[PDB]
């Protein structure tokens, strides 16, 4: 906010601009981050559009539904308890987690032999319990263009902060989970940037507010 | 007290004058001025080591016809002083008044 009538707005194209605002837009609701509309000719702020949801995030959270419930899962009853003590308990009883003093857990890395229920459990969690589920494939994040393999993760974690509680669930993470090479090629180097971006937005210079991450691999 | 302050004028006073003009003893004048200041009649300050009661702004009074002439003459003198100062200022710095 350079002045009352001079703003520094970015553009989806990429260039920055020094843009004069209209007369009806409430100047109070103009801080770092708010999306605005720019007139194509004179580049003048018009509207105060709310936060954005990347289409590659709605395409993730808008999975069908899943008809299997916790009854359909058999044999797995102790591990169901262990998972539910992190998925359901913090989201519906954040008082025992206070007087006892435990820091609420964030990640639950389901793992086992291929074909025991590591994905069916996630489908049950999506159907049962609740909270805004975000199913995440491993390779469904990686894009050809530079940086977009990390911007997608950034929007994935930003959507959760505005939809608390969130149960973000990656899958087959051994695609972007590999032990970072020391002499890998160019392809394996851009992925490591994505692994850094994912890594920081769990314990970095910020606290994950109410986001739980479920993580499955073979 | 108020009428003597307004007649005798003088921003200062004395304990003896107030005692004579109010019939109170020279020891009760202090409490008299206490009441006067507290009630808002004056805004002065006492001094007992040397009895030199100091007076400031006094409660206003309705102005009679005679007082108008004195105030008018004082206005005339003030306006003449202002006009002379303005004339001197204009004459001295006419090179930069643009």
């Amino acid at each position: 906010e350079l002045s009352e009538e001079k703003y520094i707005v970015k553009a989806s194209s990429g260039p920055r601009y020094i843009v004069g605002v209209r007369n009806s837009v409430d100047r109070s609701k103009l801080k770092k981050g708010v999306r605005v509309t720019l007139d194509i000719t004179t580049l003048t702020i018009m509207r105060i559009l709310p936060r954005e949801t990347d289409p590659l995030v709605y395409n993730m959270t808008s999975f069908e539904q899943g008809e299997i419930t916790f009854d359909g899962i058999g044999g797995l009853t102790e591990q169901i308890r262990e998972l539910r003590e992190v998925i359901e308990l913090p989201l519906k009883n954040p008082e025992i987690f206070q007087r006892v003093g435990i820091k609420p857990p964030k990640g639950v890395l389901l793992y086992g032999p291929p074909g025991t229920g590591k994905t069916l459990l996630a489908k049950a969690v999506a159907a049962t319990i609740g909270a805004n589920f975000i199913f995440s494939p491993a390779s469904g994040i990686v894009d050809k263009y530079i940086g977009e393999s990390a911007r997608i993760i950034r929007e994935m974690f930003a959507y959760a902060k505005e939809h608390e509680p969130c149960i973000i669930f990656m899958d087959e993470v051994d695609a972007i989970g590999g032990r970072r090479f020391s002499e890998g090629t160019s392809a394996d180097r851009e992925i490591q940037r994505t692994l850094m971006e994912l890594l920081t937005q769990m314990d970095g210079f910020d606290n994950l507010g109410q986001t739980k991450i479920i993580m499955a691999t073979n | 007290l108020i009428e003597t302050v307004f007649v005798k004028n003088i921003r200062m006073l004395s304990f003896e004058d107030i005692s004579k003009a109010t019939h109170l003893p020279k020891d009760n004048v202090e409490h008299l001025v206490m009441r006067a200041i507290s009630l808002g009649l004056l805004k002065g300050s006492i001094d007992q080591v040397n009895e030199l009661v100091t007076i400031s702004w006094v409660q206003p009074r309705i102005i009679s016809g005679d007082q108008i002439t004195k105030m008018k003459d004082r206005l005339v003198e003030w306006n003449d002083q202002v006009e002379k100062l303005g004339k001197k200022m204009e004459a001295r710095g006419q090179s930069i008044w643009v």
């Binding site: - | 102005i63 206005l75 306006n79």
Partner: protein
């Protein structure tokens, strides 16, 4: 009830529309011209921004024969709202030259159309004045100065002419022949000082004249005015003793600072002279050895 009468701000467009109105309807002498003062309010500083013409009529007779159209106010209101809904009626103005009898009476007609207390704006449209030709007069009810029934009368407010971005551009373009854009800072401040002194002298002469009138009883005796004058006299400081010494010591310090600053300016001029002489010598050498 809102107390919003502390400060009044007028954009030049309202006033110029007033002048255009007066020169348009061919108003001769004694014929006042009246319009509305559309603007924004509900804040401490009442701000006038736009105006329009009104079909005000009045014969120079009994003060109650004044006529003014009621439908015109609302009809202008609707169109102006269509153009801009941020400008609301905040009263009325008359084309000077001074307050008249019906000002209190007609103000009540605008009570319903206005939301707050209607604002009166006197406009010296024919320009007999020397200072600002605009002054505000909000009608308020206060006790009589003569110890009689409380009266609903006008109160003067400090009015300052100030323009916004839209109108400052036009004002600066229009008078871009007489304004001294060079001027100088200290010179313009000293000119302002002299103008303020002359204004003080004029107001003093007016007060003296009014007192001269009241001693001859052409006007009644107002005890509030006399009390204010006596307060003015009481507040007059006596200089010609402790205050005198404090003022003298401050003036001496201030002159010492002036001395230091002038010394700095002189040394800056010295460096400028040295550099300029060096460059002149270099130019002379250049021309001499390139000619030969």
């Amino acid at each position: 009830m809102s107390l919003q009468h502390e400060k009044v701000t007028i954009a030049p467009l309202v006033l110029l529309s007033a002048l255009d109105h007066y020169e348009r309807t061919q108003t001769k002498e004694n014929k006042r011209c009246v319009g509305v003062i559309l603007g924004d309010a509900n804040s401490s500083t009442i701000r006038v921004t736009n105006s329009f013409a009104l079909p005000f009529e009045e014969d120079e007779k009994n003060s109650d024969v004044w006529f003014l159209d009621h439908n015109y106010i609302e009809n202008m209101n609707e169109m102006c709202k269509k153009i801009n809904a941020k400008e609301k009626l905040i009263g009325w103005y008359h084309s000077g030259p001074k307050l008249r009898a019906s000002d209190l009476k007609i103000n009540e007609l605008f009570k319903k159309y206005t939301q707050n207390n209607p604002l009166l704006l006197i406009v010296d449209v024919k320009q007999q004045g020397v200072g600002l030709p605009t002054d505000a007069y909000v009608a308020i009810e206060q006790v009589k100065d003569d110890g009689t029934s409380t009266e609903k009368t006008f109160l003067h407010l400090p009015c300052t002419i100030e323009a916004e971005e839209a109108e400052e551009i036009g004002v600066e373009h229009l008078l871009r022949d007489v304004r001294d854009q060079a001027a100088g800072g200290l010179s313009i401040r000293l000119t302002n000082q002299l103008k303020s002194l002359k204004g003080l002298q004029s107001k003093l002469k007016d007060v003296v004249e009014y007192l001269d009138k009241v001693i001859n009883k052409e006007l009644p005796i107002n005890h509030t005015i006399l009390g204010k004058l006596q307060d003015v006299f009481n507040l007059l400081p006596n200089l010609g003793n402790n205050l005198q010494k404090a003022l003298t010591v401050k003036t001496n310090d201030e002159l010492m600072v002036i001395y230091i600053s002038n010394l700095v300016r002189s040394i800056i001029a010295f460096d400028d002279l040295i550099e300029n002489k060096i460059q002149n010598k270099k130019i002379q050498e250049q021309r001499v050895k390139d000619k030969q």
